[PDB]
Amino acid sequence: TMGNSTVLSFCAFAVDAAKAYKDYLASGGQPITNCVKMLCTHTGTGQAITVTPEANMDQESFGGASCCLYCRCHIDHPNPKGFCDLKGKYVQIPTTCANDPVGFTLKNTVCTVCGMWKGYGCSC
Ligand SMILES: c1ccc(-c2cnc[nH]2)cc1
Ligand SMILES: c1ccc(-c2cnc[nH]2)cc1
Ligand SMILES: [Cl-]
Ligand SMILES: [Cl-]
Ligand SMILES: [Zn+2]
Ligand SMILES: [Zn+2]
């Protein structure tokens, strides 16, 4: 275990920060920790990204910015306006993936229909 600061610094200065973290995880690297876990009833909508925590019984809720590689690396977000979908919001992570919220949000996409993670919560 090399530490959050070491992993984030290594990814932050890579030309592709997302690829750097994914390659690190694929090599057996310990996931980034110290994400902000929320106290909640697990009775929520189960939508992926929300104004308040919305974990259902299959999810954990976290502070959005703490689970965002770009926020955690202090670098620009990969879109023209550099907007963050996670900052100031709460992200619902499947309990099976909640050991690596940064990796989960990086690798996954929200169903534009039901607002749940494609391949997980989404049953469209
Ligand atoms: C060992 C220790 C630190 C690092 C590093 C930190 N930021 C970039 N590389 C790389 C290997
Ligand atoms: C503490 C209490 C309950 C839970 C939980 C319930 N369903 C998923 N996680 C997680 C932490
Ligand atoms: Cl830390
Ligand atoms: Cl989900
Ligand atoms: Zn962000
Ligand atoms: Zn869906």
Residue numbers in the entry: 7 to 130
Q: What does the publication say?
A:
One of the targets to possibly combat SARS-CoV-2 is nonstructural protein (nsp) 10, which forms a complex with two other viral nsps, nsp14 and nsp16. As nsp10 is not found in host cells, targeting nsp10 and thereby indirectly nsp14 and nsp16, provides an exclusive and targeted strategy to prevent SARS-CoV-2 replication.
VT00022 binds to two ligand binding sites on nsp10. In the first pocket the 4-phenyl group establishes a hydrophobic interaction with Thr12, and also with Ser11 and Ser15 from the symmetry related molecule. The 1H-imidazole moiety establishes a hydrogen bond interaction with the side chain of Ser15 (∼2.8 Å) and Thr12 (∼3.0 Å) from the symmetry related molecule. In addition, there are hydrophobic interactions with Thr47 and Thr49 from the symmetry related molecule. Interestingly, one of the binding sites on nsp10 for VT00022 is located exactly in the interface between nsp14 and nsp10. A magnification of the binding site reveals that VT00022 would directly clash with residues Met62 and Asn63 of nsp14. Similarly interesting, the second ligand binding site identified is occupied by all four fragment hits and is located in the interface between nsp10 and nsp16, its second binding partner.
